[PDB]
């Protein structure tokens, strides 16, 4: 069963974020996972890749990117690219895949009302902290009023514990990050969904949808890094039809 | 009240106890004595209702929580410096040392030895079952599995435990007398988890079983079930050398 975002989706738009759930592979990969480096059978990952495609409707394959947990977006101009170094995507181009794979971190997925241009973000906390998503908002050539933003299955407020550094990270940049912290033993329980709305309102985002799950928590559900340790992944995508 | 009592030849020198949602200051959803720090409950509420489960129970000493991932790991208590708390089961010979294991559906199994100088408790989801956490909990024991009592805490039971052909299809996969616990339900199977735990251990010659009669989704007022409530609270079952 796959993940269909709950926003006022545009016309010539179309989303789907992936479960553990319909697939092929054996524990700890059941079943479902898309991730073709976290030691799962090849065979299998491959498979399930096909099932989701789909599943979901896709028109082509999606653009994986090499992502590095930082803040680069990488323009999904033309299909031989120089590097795929990267952490969130771009598109004004028909047919073409944004998707970002994760499993605890943030995805968020971008959109225009006019249905235009998409964005797909792999939002961990370090990118999150140093703006990736104000670097994917600066990418599209509408306005911030006129974007659309989905917050995909994340690691949530009960679950994401991190160290006095991280909060402290945070602050250092917007203080009102502060919020999104809630003291716990020497560490914090963090609200990744929190700290992604802070940031997307100080670039004029306002219509923010999705932020309701936990990979975390719900395991029937979701792989979890944090859980599992090995694991297998999910994703998100969003394309231009 | 607070408090079942296993009921079983519990050895001299042996204590257990395994908590309801009565009895505490929680309000709904977790109403009312949620131990559970991380479902959003009021955390005053949540060390309270602790306080008066440890002070009823007359632990000797705070349990040893677990960080519950679902697995199979079985954490020995061997001193407080430990390199994880990841696991979901403890072992324990230490006198004072209390195992503990948090479920609001998952089944609780507490075991010991006639001898009463060997505890543990585990927290078995179906995954962590399956996977051999029994199995890997009664191997921690130095005593054989013949002196070896263990107790089926409240769980949800074969009525309400719905799950998919896949899972059916895991526990077959390990042994298909596991077939027997399975009764088909539409495109889904009911799962008597009592049954699948008691062949486990019947497999490793643990032959001394009690409990296995309640049924967390079922009975609304006696326990927090997570399918029945999604955000609910949780209780604990525990276990101790004197
Ligand atoms: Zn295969
Ligand atoms: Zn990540
Ligand atoms: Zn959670
Ligand atoms: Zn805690
Ligand atoms: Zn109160
Ligand atoms: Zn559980
Ligand atoms: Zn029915
Ligand atoms: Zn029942």
Redesign the interface.
């Known amino acids: 069963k796959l993940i269909v975002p709950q926003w006022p989706l545009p016309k010539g738009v179309a989303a789907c974020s992936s479960t553990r759930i319909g697939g092929v592979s054996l524990?700890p990969y059941?079943?479902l996972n898309l991730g073709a480096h976290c030691g799962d059978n090849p065979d299998h990952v491959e498979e399930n890749r096909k099932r989701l495609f789909a599943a979901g409707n896709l028109p082509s394959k999606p653009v994986w990117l090499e992502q590095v947990h930082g803040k680069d977006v990488l323009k999904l101009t033309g299909e031989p690219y120089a590097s795929k170094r990267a952490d969130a995507s771009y598109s004004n181009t028909p047919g073409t895949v944004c998707a970002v794979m994760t499993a605890d971190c943030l995805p968020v997925l971008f959109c225009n009302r006019a249905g235009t241009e998409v964005a797909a973000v792999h939002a961990g906390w370090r990118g999150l902290c140093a703006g990736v998503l104000e670097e994917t908002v600066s990418c599209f050539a509408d306005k911030p009023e006129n974007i659309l933003a989905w917050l995909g299955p994340a690691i949530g407020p009960?679950?994401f514990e991190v160290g006095a550094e991280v909060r402290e990270a945070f602050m250092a940049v917007d203080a009102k990050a502060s919020a999104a912290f809630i003291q716990h033993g020497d560490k914090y329980l963090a609200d990744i969904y929190q700290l992604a709305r802070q940031r997307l309102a100080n670039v004029g985002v306002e219509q923010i949808f999705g932020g309701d799950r936990c990979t975390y928590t719900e395991?029937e559900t979701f792989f979890s890094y944090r859980?599992?340790k090995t694991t297998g992944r999910m994703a998100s995508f969003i394309w231009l039809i």
């Open positions: 524990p059941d079943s009960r679950a395991n859980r599992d």
